[PDB]
Design a protein that fits this description.
part of a larger assembly; 4 chains; A mainly alpha; B mainly beta; C alpha/beta; D little secondary structure; B: mainly beta; four-stranded antiparallel β-sheet; 10 strands; 55% strand; C: six-stranded mixed β-sheet; 6 helices; 6 strands; RNA-binding; Large ribosomal subunit protein uL15 (chain D); ribosomal protein (chain C); Large ribosomal subunit protein uL4 (chain C); Ribosomal_uL4 (chain C); rRNA-binding (chain C)
Chain lengths: 118, 102, 206, 49
RNA sequence: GGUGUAGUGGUAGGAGAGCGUUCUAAGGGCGUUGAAGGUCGAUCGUGAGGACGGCUGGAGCGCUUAGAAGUGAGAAUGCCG
RNA sequence: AUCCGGGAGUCAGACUGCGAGUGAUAAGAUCCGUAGUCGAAAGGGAAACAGCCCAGACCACCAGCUAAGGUCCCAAAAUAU
RNA sequence: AGUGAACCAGUACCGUGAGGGAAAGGUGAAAAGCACCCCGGAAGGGGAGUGAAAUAGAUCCUGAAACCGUGUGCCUACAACAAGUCAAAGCUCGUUAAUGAGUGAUGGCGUGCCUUUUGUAGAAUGAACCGGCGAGUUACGAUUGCAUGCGAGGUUAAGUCG
């Protein structure tokens, strides 16, 4: 009882080629080229889910430094001041305030300045 | 009118009339929720309280339990003839906001 | 175990007490699975072959040289990887049949007839007589006893008019009482056995 | 027992192992034989004793 | 079923449990009011993989349970086109 | 941990502390002993870097604290006392 | 695939010779196989007709990929690029309806796949590309684990009827 290899390989290969839409040239049209490229993209995406969380933290931190130097402080002294006062705002909300509500950011910077005035 | 709340393991910015996505809650759709911990009540004048603002809550209604889009995590070691593949979809709940503390 | 008796049309002409060692003995289910599988693998005709490297009508010469030609070393026009070459490890003529020990054969026969009885699926009848072989009268008889499923008809002996009349009906199978197998009883929904044939089966299963 | 509901007894039949059918099964690419040597060849090995 | 606590990199290699192909049996189904195959889609599952809809196509094919295997391809300075 | 049984693979190692021989107390040299990493180990530091310093990836997050190493600009944090 | 050979095959073809040796199946239910006209030397094409269907027209069932073209939504002539991945304005659409789809200036990060190696991006090895084919099988013995029937016992071989 013989088993022809009819329509299984074409389905698997067309599933692979559909993931390669938008690539350059023979990297979206030939199966071997696309196979290798798709493997590399899997590697890159796993790597970059972890690197994302670092990039936004550096972005927030630099915006907060910029805002605080306008209120007579630097980033490190203002973070210490907020900790000595028991304030628990993220660096995300801090930067969001720094860009949207400058008066709220100044209220907070004054609390920090009074905390480390002791 | 602003409030900042601790939900999940993170913090969110909140407003009356707007809807928010959040980690899964253990509350069926249509029922009411109280977010106890408020970090800051902005708006016109800010209430910058040590960890939480004393006596402010935020009220809402759960609308929908869902799933995020799918993530694929695939892993291979070049030249070592081996790989392993795994999928994952993440739960969430959607909440509408009503009556920041009054 | 007592079964009711019928006539070619009628009613409850009493009952018939059958053996308890044959028709009432609590079937064993893996023994029946084994019997069915052995019998089905026993009907195969394993007549299949293919040609290996040395049977294909072909070449003993080395087709090109071993080196120099900028080629790949090849040994014959008939190698497994050449188009038109011979097959590596195909089907060969084989047997497919085996035997189970004698006590489990007998245990499976007893168990399958006893299962038929434990659900009022065996139907006993005094006699099946016919002056001519007529299919139409057999169908009337079959409806006389309200039988509407696949049925095994177990007959006695040179009751040849009945077997002729019961052929050709597409729900009906006919077997004599010296030739019942395990696969005949499992496939039918009911058994229609005559009183004579029932004692004759009790005589050989003992 | 009906011919459309067969079931062997538990533990009585096992499947089979097919070597040389991909990496993730556990036995692709050299099929359990290790790297090179007399024992990696077809018909390789030394006589008993 | 709850709840706690602990664990979950991996080549050679051992152990477990599954996905898909073709054919046999028994059962229950579909089809010119359009089967298989082909093409497109923004769909589902932890993986192999599974559906539903459009267009093409013109006569056969699924599903359940068990069985049997010429049962899975990217590489051999492989063979044919 | 020990005892009985089924199935293996390995018998080309490399560098870095430490302590010895051969060498010229030369070699990314060679041959032994003892500990680690690599082999079979991703992530941060060392410009780039198998084997050095920190640390062992089941998965999701636009949350938090630290290690080695750092804070004038490239490039996150003191133009600190 | 199955005979080397489903077809005018031990043929065409190759060799002084002995000898070696292929490729090549499918319109439609029925030839109803396109009368007549127009462009053109013809080939071929466009109407008109046959037919359920001609994009079933003889290179005739279905008609995949490589490869070659035509039309368009978005980008591109100061820029060093294993070609993607993560972040993201503008433009263009509107789906198995849901945390929608295509393209994308600009910014961070990043030396293919396989084999053999102490060790590889390797200036070590293989592959032009696409499709098909292409590798732990069976017979008879020996041993262990699991499963079933009998149990101080267990079991038949050749053969005879079927």
């Amino acid at each position: 009882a013989r088993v022809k290899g009819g329509t299984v390989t074409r389905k698997r290969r067309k599933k692979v080629l559909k993931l390669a839409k938008g690539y350059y040239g023979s990297k979206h049209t030939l199966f071997k080229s696309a196979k290798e490229q798709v493997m590399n993209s899997y590697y890159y995406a796993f790597r970059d889910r972890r690197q994302k969380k670092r990039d936004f933290r550096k972005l927030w931190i630099a915006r907060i430094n910029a805002a605080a130097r306008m209120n007579g402080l630097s980033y490190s002294k203002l973070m210490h001041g907020l900790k000595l006062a028991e304030i628990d705002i993220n660096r995300k909300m801090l930067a969001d305030l720094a860009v949207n509500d400058a008066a709220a950011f100044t209220a907070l910077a004054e609390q920090a300045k009074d905390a480390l005035s002791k | 009118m602003y409030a900042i709340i601790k939900t999940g393991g993170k913090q969110v910015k909140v407003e009356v009339g707007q809807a928010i996505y959040v980690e899964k809650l253990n509350v069926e759709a249509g029922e009411k929720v109280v977010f106890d911990e408020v970090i800051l009540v902005g708006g016109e004048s800010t209430k910058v309280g040590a960890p939480t603002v004393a006596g402010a809550t935020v009220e809402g209604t759960v609308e929908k339990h869902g799933k995020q889009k799918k993530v694929v995590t695939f892993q291979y070691k070049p030249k070592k003839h081996s790989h392993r593949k795994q999928g994952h979809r993440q739960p969430y709940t959607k909440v509408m906001i009503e009556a920041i503390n009054a | 175990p007592n079964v009711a008796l019928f006539k070619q049309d009628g009613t409850q002409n009493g009952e018939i007490t059958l053996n308890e060692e044959i028709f009432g003995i609590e079937p064993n289910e893996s023994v029946v699975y084994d019997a069915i599988i052995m019998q089905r693998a026993s009907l195969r005709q394993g007549t299949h072959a293919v040609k290996n490297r040395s049977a294909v009508r072909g070449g003993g010469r080395k087709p090109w040289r071993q080196k120099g030609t900028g080629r790949a070393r090849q040994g014959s026009i008939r190698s497994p990887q050449w188009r038109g070459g011979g097959v590596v490890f195909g089907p060969t003529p084989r047997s497919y049949s085996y035997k189970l020990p004698k006590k489990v054969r007998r245990l499976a026969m007893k168990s399958v007839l006893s299962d038929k009885v434990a659900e009022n699926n065996l139907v006993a009848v005094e006699g099946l007589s016919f002056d001519a072989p007529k299919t139409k009268e057999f169908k009337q008889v079959l409806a006389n006893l309200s039988i509407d499923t696949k049925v095994l008809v177990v007959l006695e002996n040179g009751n040849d008019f009945a077997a002729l009349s019961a052929r050709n009906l597409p729900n009906v199978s006919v077997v004599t009482s010296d030739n019942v197998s395990v696969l005949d009883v499992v496939s039918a929904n009911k058994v229609l056995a005559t009183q004579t044939a029932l004692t004759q089966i009790e005589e050989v299963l003992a | 027992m009906k011919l459309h509901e067969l079931k062997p007894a538990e533990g009585s039949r096992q499947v089979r192992n097919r070597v040389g059918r991909g990496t993730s099964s556990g036995n692709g690419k050299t099929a359990g034989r290790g790297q090179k040597g007399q024992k990696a060849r077809s018909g390789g090995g030394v006589r008993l004793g």
